[PDB]
Amino acid sequence: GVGVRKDINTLTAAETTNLRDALRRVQAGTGRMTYDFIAGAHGYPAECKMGEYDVACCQHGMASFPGWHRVFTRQMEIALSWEGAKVGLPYWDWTEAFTELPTLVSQEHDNPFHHGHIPGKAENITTTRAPRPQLFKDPEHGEESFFFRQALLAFEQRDFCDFEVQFEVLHNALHSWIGGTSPYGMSTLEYAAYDPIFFIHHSNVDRQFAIWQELQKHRGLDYNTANCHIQDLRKPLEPFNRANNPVLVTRVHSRAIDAFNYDQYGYQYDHLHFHGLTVDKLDEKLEKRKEQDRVFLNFMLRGIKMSADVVFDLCNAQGTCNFAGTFAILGGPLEMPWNFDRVFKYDVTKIFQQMRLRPDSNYTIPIRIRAVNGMQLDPNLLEPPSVTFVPGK
């Protein structure tokens, strides 16, 4: 139990009550660490500097994102343990089909997981959620969950920095589509960590990282280190490196390169079976996907000082158009500027096949970009995608 992250759907009523009691104490600010102190490491109030400008400390849009958020998620989990939690932060596997948010977080009354207070505002100013409909309805009408298929393409990657782009962009969709137009909530960088669902999401995100590390181990590849962005992964994961961090284990292991070894931080998962597949069976499924000829769109992403949803259509030369996919960017005015150094890949094989289009056919791919407050943005904010054909192996 202690330090064990369980699937949220396996919690007992006693474990649920215990986690709620521990979070209530962390949010009350009377305990060893306060919810504000921890949540403030992520976005608002800006706790980092980029020269003279105050910026959010969370690392996004870069190879250090998984390690930064691994350490952050453990920091909150330790705060809960110090206030009596007997289990670790449960993970919600949102790659399984679901029709509503987990009851742990959706219960409105007597539930610390429902929302968080915004520091600096009156006590009744809290995070809210405004969930977007595609959170619950597969926008591609495909086989299994939209999020499952996106996760498989991430898990296919055999290099950490290639994995990381797929991984992080998938994780953005849950932020965007839980928070929606909420002024304070999951869909902005500034306030997302004040909603306790942040940490249920990031427990699952961290478990996906752990699953990919198991895949890399089984493949005979790097899983406790990486050979890309080598100096970047040695930078401090601010603010966890600072002397006022009361948690020894996160303060002393406060580089992304240290964060590959999650055991040393004192936690583990109940298991790492992805949809009840062992690691060898998962990798077998990934290898089978690679036997087919596929078409991908390739997007170059960068921070745009806001969060947004991108949608694209595939239109044949006669003007018949079908929805071809979607992804999200997480951000806000406090973001550290960023540009990925490689494409974000998006599988459009099925929609090309169904429209009887080859990659070298005549077609267009219209792009739309909408900020999470609902405002349409200029599609030219992002470079148009490129098209690749990948023959089956």
Ligand X SMILES: *[C@@H]1O[C@H](CO[C@@H]2O[C@@H](C)[C@@H](O)[C@@H](O)[C@@H]2O)[C@@H](O[C@@H]2O[C@H](CO)[C@@H](O[C@@H]3O[C@H](CO[C@H]4O[C@H](CO)[C@@H](O)[C@H](O)[C@@H]4O[C@@H]4O[C@H](CO)[C@@H](O)[C@H](O)[C@H]4NC(C)=O)[C@@H](O)[C@H](O)[C@@H]3O)[C@H](O)[C@H]2NC(C)=O)[C@H](O)[C@H]1NC(C)=O
Ligand Y SMILES: *[C@@H]1O[C@H](CO)[C@@H](O)[C@H](O)[C@H]1NC(C)=O
Q: How far is the CB of 30 from ligand X (least distance, A)?
A: 19
In three-state secondary structure terms, 313 is strand
Decide whether 192 or 357 has the Cβ nearer to ligand Y.
357
Q: What does DSSP assign to residue 381? A: G
Sequence-ordered alpha helix ranges (H) in 64-183: 65-82, 103-106, 146-156, 160-179
Strand partners, 371: 308
361 binds, among ligand Y, ligand CUO, ligand X, none (CB under 5 to 8 A by kind): ligand Y
Query: Distance between CA atoms of 186 and 268, rounded to whole angstroms?
Result: 25
* Token pair for 249: 């284990």
Please select the residue that binds ligand CUO; options are 57, 58, 314, 369, rule is CB under 6 A. 58
Contact flags string 197-226 toward ligand CUO, x per CB under 6 A: -----x------------------------
Decide whether 264 or 361 has the Cβ nearer to ligand Y.
361
Query: Distance between CA atoms of 377 and 328, rounded to whole angstroms?
Result: 13
Place of tokens 């009840």: 276
Contact flags string 124-163 toward ligand X, x per CB under 6 A: x---------------------------------------
Contact flags string 59-78 toward ligand CUO, x per CB under 6 A: -x--------x---------
Number of Cβ within 10 Å of residue 359's Cβ equals 15
122 binds, among ligand Y, ligand CUO, ligand X, none (CB under 5 to 8 A by kind): ligand X
Query: Distance between CA atoms of 60 and 302, rounded to whole angstroms?
Result: 10
Strand partners, 377: 369
**Contact between residue 237 and residue 259 where contact means Cβ atoms under 8 Å apart:** yes
Name residues contacting ligand Y, limited to 332-391 (CB under 6 A): 361-362
Q: How far is the CB of 358 from ligand Y (least distance, A)?
A: 8
* Residue (of 119, 111, 115) closest to 29 by Cα position: 119
320 binds ligand Y (CB under 6 A): no
Residue nearest to ligand CUO (CB): 58
How many residues belong to the site for ligand X (CB under 6 A)? 3
Rounded to 10 deg, the angle between the 65-82 and 197-218 helix axes is 120
122 binds ligand X (CB under 6 A): yes
* Positions in the binding site for ligand CUO (CB under 6 A): 42, 58, 60, 69, 171, 175, 192, 202, 330
* Positions in the binding site for ligand X (CB under 6 A): 122-124
* Positions in the binding site for ligand Y (CB under 6 A): 361-362
